Amino acid sequence: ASTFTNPVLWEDHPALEVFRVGSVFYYSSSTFAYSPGAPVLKSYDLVHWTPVTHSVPRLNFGSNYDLPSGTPGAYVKGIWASTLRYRRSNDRFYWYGCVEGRTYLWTSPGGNALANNGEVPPSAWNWQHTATIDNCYYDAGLLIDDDDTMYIAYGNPTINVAQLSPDGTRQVRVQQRVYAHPQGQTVEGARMYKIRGNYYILVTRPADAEYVLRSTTGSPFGPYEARTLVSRIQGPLANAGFAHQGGIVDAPDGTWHYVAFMDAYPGGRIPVVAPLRWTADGWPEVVTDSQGRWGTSYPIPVRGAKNATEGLASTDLDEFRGTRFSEHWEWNHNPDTSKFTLLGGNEGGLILRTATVTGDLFAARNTLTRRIAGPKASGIFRLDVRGMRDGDRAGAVLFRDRAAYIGVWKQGNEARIVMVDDLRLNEDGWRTASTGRVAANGPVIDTNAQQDIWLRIDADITPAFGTNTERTTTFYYSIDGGRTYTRLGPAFAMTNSWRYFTGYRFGVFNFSTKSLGGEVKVKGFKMNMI
């Protein structure tokens, strides 16, 4: 396939950093209070991406990341725009991110990637907390320079550059205000580069432009001068704001590409790719289509690229086998590890024991989530719910700050299917605004039905950002082994607001309104494109 179409991945992976090691491209994204945090995706062509690891296996940023006492928890805090690079000299990946005023470094060995055309064996990833720096590198962009000195560009509304110690664990020096926009416009989203002898920093003007800065002195400390890379460019997707932020990366053939993202709410922020050309005077420019738009299709960045993949694809059936989750799953806040187990053996399965007593889904620990692929997808959870106890509520949630679910309520000796809507957080502070209402009752389910209940969410995430239209999701259940599905409840209208940042997700939850002791088994999950 000699060309590709935008977007390259229709899944919420915001604040991307991209770089190349040998034959492999790596992409790092932001995850807020979702745990594990800071996913890493891998590609051979900048187009087909597979998740391979997460840089922060459990969030270590403070006790609120364990959701100890309900809303506002650490909702919409945690990992904002951060940065990742691979250091050849010690075969180590470095992830830095500022969270609530301190900067955290997590590192992993690379399994000798520099020597194996950039491949990291799946077993070699092993991320550990390596340092904390007592300066906030808001919207950090790491550069490992050609002489092995490490720098971080950061800031909002103006850009600073810090020099780190040789081991990357301490700040040695900061130059403040290496760039300020001359008309007082806010910039942020720094990514930092050393390209053919010169220093570049990419910054965004939220949320519609990207500037390229270049050091006027040839020093990493600048000062820097700017040119526009994109400003309010049209395409390649409608109703998804503007392509901005992101970063630039070289393919093995020496050609450069700009990987930006779109505000494709209600789905989230998704990556788009364009080629770059370099001017004779040493600046990069986006290659547009014949109409000056970010093109819907372009030549493939790598020809005859490897197609091999690690682990389960986004749409692959996941029966929760083995000892670890696939790279697609993330908990809402850190999980209580004493309250879930992956069963292993022939069948696998995930046991979710109730971990929180609450009437409020947003206060519940151990809600397991994953990204919805767009523009439309069905997510199906298969459960055994015989272990539910009085007051337990479990099910499949369309999860965000305006949420709905289809699930099972156990009251006394009755288990029944319900559809619940009007679950809402207040965008001003993220306290609960509504704990929901039963919008429809489904049937009472007997023990045989309880042993195999299938819960289905059909979500439409077709972009609607900036429009007056809200997309809708519908909910279904099966109590005949997935052979027949029955619709339950109204169509649920989804928010287009950007304030929660993360897109809508599919999730499975289990909590109690009375007491702990109950459990469900999640036998499987499947996402189908619809």
Ligand X SMILES: OC[C@@H]1O[C@@H](O[C@H]2[C@H](O[C@@H]3CO[C@@H](O)[C@H](O)[C@H]3O)OC[C@@H](O[C@@H]3OC[C@@H](O)[C@H](O)[C@H]3O)[C@@H]2O)[C@H](O)[C@H]1O
23 near ligand X, judged by CB under 6 A: no
Choice from 263, 392, 421, 460 touching ligand X (CB under 6 A): 263
Among residues 72, 241, 295, 374, which is the contact residue for ligand X, using CB under 6 A?
241
What are the two backbone dihedrals, phi and then psi, of residue 123, each rounded to the nearest 5 degrees?
A: -75, -20
CB 30 within 8 A of CB 79: yes
Whichever of 241 and 379 has its CB closer to ligand X, that residue is 241
Q: Which of 5, 116, 156, 309 binds ligand X (CB under 6 A)?
A: 156
State which residue, 436 or 503, has the beta carbon closest to ligand X: 503
Query: How many whole angstroms separate alpha carbon 136 and alpha carbon 154?
Result: 9
Q: Do the beta carbons of residue 284 and residue 274 sit within 8 Å?
A: no
Binding flag, residue 12, ligand X (CB under 6 A)? no
Could you say whether residue 283 binds ligand X (CB under 6 A)? no
Considering beta carbons, is residue 269 or 376 the nearer one to ligand X? 269
Contact between 108 and ligand X by CB under 6 A: the answer reads no
Pick the piece of the chain touching ligand X (CB under 6 A) from 59-67, 201-209, 286-294, 471-479: 201-209
Nearest distance from C-beta of residue 401 to ligand X, angstroms: 14
Pairing of strands 34-35, 24-28: unpaired
136 contacts ligand X (rule: CB under 6 A): no
427 binds ligand X per the rule CB under 6 A: no
| Close Cβ partners of 147 (under 8 Å, ≥ 6 residues apart) | none
Binder of ligand X out of 214, 269, 410, 505 (CB under 6 A): 269
The residues, any chain, with a CB within 8 Å of residue 450's CB and separated by 6 or more, are 384, 385, 386, 388, 408, 415
3-state helix, strand, coil in the chain (%, to 5): 5, 45, 50
Report, in Å, the least distance between residue 24 CB and ligand X: 27
Q: Which residues contact 63 (CB under 8 A, 6 or more apart)?
A: none
The distance of closest approach from Cβ of residue 76 to ligand X in the complex, given in angstroms and rounded to an integer, is: 10
Residue number with CB closer to ligand X (187 or 385): 187
Q: Does 220 bind ligand X (CB under 6 A)?
A: no
Q: How far is the CB of 239 from ligand X (least distance, A)?
A: 12
- Which of the stretches 237-245, 274-282, 303-311, 385-393 binds ligand X when contact is defined by CB under 6 A? 237-245
User: Does residue 401 bind ligand X (CB under 6 A)?
Assistant: no
**What's the CA dihedral at 421, 73, 341, 521 to 10 degrees?**
-10
For position 206 contacting ligand X by CB under 6 A, the verdict is yes
User: What token pair was written down for 313?
Assistant: 């694809």
Strand partners, 202: 191, 212
Q: Are 85 and 19 in contact (CB under 8 A)?
A: yes
Residue 315 near residue 345, CB atoms below 8 Å? no
Positions in 473-512 near ligand X (CB under 6 A): 498
Q: Are 423 and 407 in contact (CB under 8 A)?
A: no
Q: Which residues bind ligand X (CB under 6 A)?
A: 156, 204, 206-207, 241, 244-245, 263, 269, 498
